[PDB]
């Protein structure tokens, strides 16, 4: 519900990061734009239950590294 | 009950991710569509107890890495 | 009581995952069908205390990997 | 009192798994039949404090792997 | 008080497992007989504080493996 | 107070295990006899704060293995 | 205050183990004599805060092993 | 419900006689050990509805004689 | 209604004895498993009105001796 | 009214035992199916006054032995 | 008034068994059809005081065996 | 008063069976006609104390067999 | 419940006859010692349900004569 | 509990017949002396549950005849 | 308590028949003198529980015939 | 009534020491078994008034030494 | 009740001194183990009324000196 | 109870004198150390009922002189 975070680095211009709400319904809550080279450190909270990443990006989580190729 | 997440990367167009209800009866509660190259970080919550994945995909959990080919 | 999950991947058509009821008496309360290639991440909850797996399947738990040949 | 599970795989037909009752009085409260190849993941709860396994079987616990030759 | 367990496998016929009472008074509270090849997984409970094993047996605990030759 | 245990195996006939009371006063409250080959798994409780072992025995604790020659 | 213990083995006759009182004023609370070969497993409690060991003895703690030669 | 009895003679060492309780649930109630040569005359009562005999024994009932070869 | 018994001796491993309910509707109420060579003396009670026997077995009643081969 | 029983042994697959209701009106209230070799011990009760047997069967009553060829 | 039964076996097709009512007024209250080879065990109750059998049949009672040639 | 019965088989056409009233007054209360070959099983009741049989018939009672040649 | 007796004749010095308690729990209730030649006629009572005989002895019951060779 | 008797004949001078009480405790109630040739017919009562016979005597019970040699 | 009797015939002059008191206390309650040839049919009653016979006499009981030679 | 003791030493296997109760009725209260070589120091109490010794034994009292030969 | 004592000296390893309960019921209430050479001066108390000595030992009482050889 | 004393003289360095508590529960109460040559005159009281002496010592009581060698 908290206390865990992800690290996303943008590898190209125009990377989109979307947060899905917490509750009975699942609706979009917010989105963020990242330009090439930017780093975002995001946390799981009371209003966020899922994080969706579009665009070429490098992601670090507790389970290791992954690369999105959108 | 809460505070654990899975990482799903879509390896093909049209991958389905389904969340099942938490309660006495089990029913489909929400689903998400993923495009090729896209990444979702999903958490276990107060309305979701099980997660099904349809389509070719790459999954990371606390127990390791698996690949689905449905 | 909660907060622990298993990962099941179906290696054949028609794999059955049965949940057993939590309480004084024990009975089947839910069946799940998996087709060849699908992956299910299932959690221990307030209504489930045991899980039975019939069919050829690949299972990951905190204690390691096992293969069912039912 | 809770939150610990065992993994039992039946290596031959007709394996019996018996659960003992929690309290001042200890009585047999349920048993399960396993056919050759099936897998059961079972949890310690408020009504089960001990588990007995009869028949040839393969068991995984937090302390390692054991085999019953019954 | 609870939430720990031992694994006992009987290496000969007629193995006795005795549970001693928890409290100011210390007395035999229950015992179990194990046939050859059987495996018992036993948990420390609110009514059990000590466990005595008579007969030839193989025991797994968090501190390692031991062999009783009673 | 609880949630910790020792494993004692008797290497000779007539091993004595003595449990000391918990509180302002410290007096013997119980003892147990062990024959050659027997194994006792004993827990720390609300009425026991110290344990004494007389006789040739082999002991397993969280800090390792020790042997008493008494 | 609890949940931590020391293991003392007497290597000579007449080993003294002294407990100091828990509170604002510090004084002797109890002591124990150990004969050659005996093993004592002692726990920290609500009435004991420090432990003194006089005589030749072998001590195991969470931080390692030490030998007293007084 | 009463007024009828069985006679069991032990033909070998270690014969077990088990009594099952009377009521809606059927749980074990008591067991007895017989050494080679002993005779037990047991009655049906308010807390006993079935009797189970393990081991080589010679049994006399109103319907005649039988021999268990366990 | 009460006070009559049957004697069943198992002539093979895995013999099932089933007791049916006493009431308006008839349902399975309990079952027992018997090993090769064991004898059960069962009584008619306030919750049991009929008894079914599956497996090779030898039966004694007031009316004589019969053999089942199911 | 009660306290008397019949013994039926099935000599062919699919033997039917029908119970007739006790009271002013008479109707079928229970069917029982027996496979070849099974034995049923059935008692006259507060809801059963007559018993119909269809199929090849061997029947024992207080008056002797009969064989049905239905 | 109760607790006595007759055994009727139908030796040819179309055997009729009629029960007469108990009380000051005697009237036909039920009848049964039996096909060749069928067996019926019937009891005397609070609504049946006499039984009439038409057709070729074989009857067993406490007084012996009789045959109806109807 | 009750709970005894006679068996009458008609050896010729038109056999009359008459039941006489129980009490201070004695009178015909009911009669039955039997065709050739028929069998009637009749019970002594609260309204019947004596039975008269006219016509050729074969009678079985607890005291033996008799033949009426009326 | 009551009203049935056994006859025990001691064929050697020091024969033990043990009576077990009637109720929910079973324990020793009394015992008797018999010298060579003595005869005891013992009745089933409201505080006794089972009887053990240790030693060489000759026993008479309603079901016949048996000998204990303890 | 009542209404059953034994017959004892004295075959030697000085035969002793001892009666034990009926209740929670088994305490001697009375004894009787018999000279050579005497016959005693003794019944089971509300204050008597067991009978011991010392000396050379001849005993008749419902189960047959025995001879005490003491 | 009642409904059983003995038959005593006096084979010599002066035969004594003594009745002992029924209750917690036992004492002589009555006696009868029989001359040679006389016959007495005596019953067990509410005030009598044991009977002694002194003198040469012939006795008939439910268990057979005996001869007293006092 | 109090404060006096006897000393009993067993000179043979199986010596019996019986204590008689203090009151209007002098009856057995307890017995004790002594093996060869044991010594029992027994006092006179409020529930004890007499002591019987059976078997070969050596007794010391205030009045001197005696030897029981039984 | 008090004011008297015994003196026991242990002449061998492992001498047992057992105290029996004072009252209507008699049971083991405490025991002491003596190593070779030790001396125990024991007193009769309000809770102790008899004392047993097992093992080789030397005993002094008001009546003199005795030697136990258990 | 009181008013009796024992004289102990230490014949070697380090002699231990242990006093045992008076009451239903028996447990160590106090100990005393004696060096070579020292003398202790100890009494019996309401908190002491038994006394143990470890080490080489010379003891005087009302019953005489004894020596401990421990
Ligand atoms: Co935008
Ligand atoms: Co969709
Ligand atoms: Co047991
Ligand atoms: Co089953
Ligand atoms: Co005894
Ligand atoms: Co007179
Ligand atoms: Co002990
Ligand atoms: Co000190």
Numbering used by the authors:
A (entry chain iC), B (entry chain 5C), C (entry chain M), D (entry chain k), E (entry chain 7), F (entry chain UA), ...: 3 to 72
Task: Copy text from the publication.
Based on the crystal structure of wild‐type TRAP, a histidine residue was introduced at position 33 of the TRAPK35C variant, yielding TRAPS33H/K35C, where the histidine and cysteine residues are located at i and i+2 positions of the β‐sheet motif around the rim of the ring‐shaped structure. The cysteine residue at position 35 of TRAPS33H/K35C was further changed to histidine, resulting in another variant, TRAPS33H/K35H, possessing a pair of imidazole ligands. When the TRAPS33H/K35H protein was mixed with Co(II) or Zn(II), it showed the formation of pseudospherical cages with a diameter of ≈22 nm, similar to TRAP Au(I) 24‐cage. We constructured a number of cages named as follows: Cages made with Zn(II) (TRAPK35C‐Zn(II)‐cages); TRAPS33H/K35H with either Co(II) or Zn(II) (TRAPS33H/K35H‐Co(II) or ‐Zn(II)‐cages); TRAPS33H/K35C with Zn(II) (TRAPS33H/K35C‐Zn(II)‐cages). To verify our designs, we solved the structures of TRAPS33H/K35H‐Zn(II)‐cage, TRAPS33H/K35H‐Co(II)‐cage, and TRAPK35C‐Zn(II)‐cages using cryoEM single particle reconstruction (see Methods for sample preparation and Figures S2–S4 for analysis pipelines). The resulting structures showed that these cages are mainly composed of 24 TRAP rings, and the overall shape and bonding network between adjacent rings is retained when compared to the TRAPAu(I) 24‐cage. They form two chiral cages, and each ring forms two metal‐mediated bridges with each neighbor. In the structure of TRAPS33H/K35H‐Co(II)‐cage, every bridge has in its center one ion in close proximity to the histidine residues introduced in positions 33 and 35 as expected. However, a closer analysis revealed that the coordination geometry is unlikely to be a perfect tetrahedron but rather a distorted one or an octahedron formed by 4 histidine ligands from the protein and 2 bonds with other ligands such as water molecules (which are not visible due to limited resolution). TRAP‐cages that possess only histidine ligands, TRAPS33H/K35H‐Co(II) cages, and TRAPS33H/K35H‐Zn(II) cages, almost completely disassembled in the presence of 35 µM EDTA (1 equivalent to TRAP monomer). TRAPS33H/K35H‐Co(II) and Zn(II)‐cages were more sensitive to pH, disassembling completely at pHs below 4–6 and above 8–10.
TRAP has proved a useful building block for construction of artificial nanostructures. The wild‐type protein forms a ring‐shaped assembly comprising 11 identical monomers. We have shown that cysteine‐modified variants of the trp RNA binding attenuation protein, assemble into cage‐like structures with Au(I) or Hg(II), called TRAP‐cage, disassembly of which can be induced by thiol‐ or phosphine‐containing compounds. Here, we report variants of TRAP which can assemble into TRAP‐cages mediated by Co(II) or Zn(II).
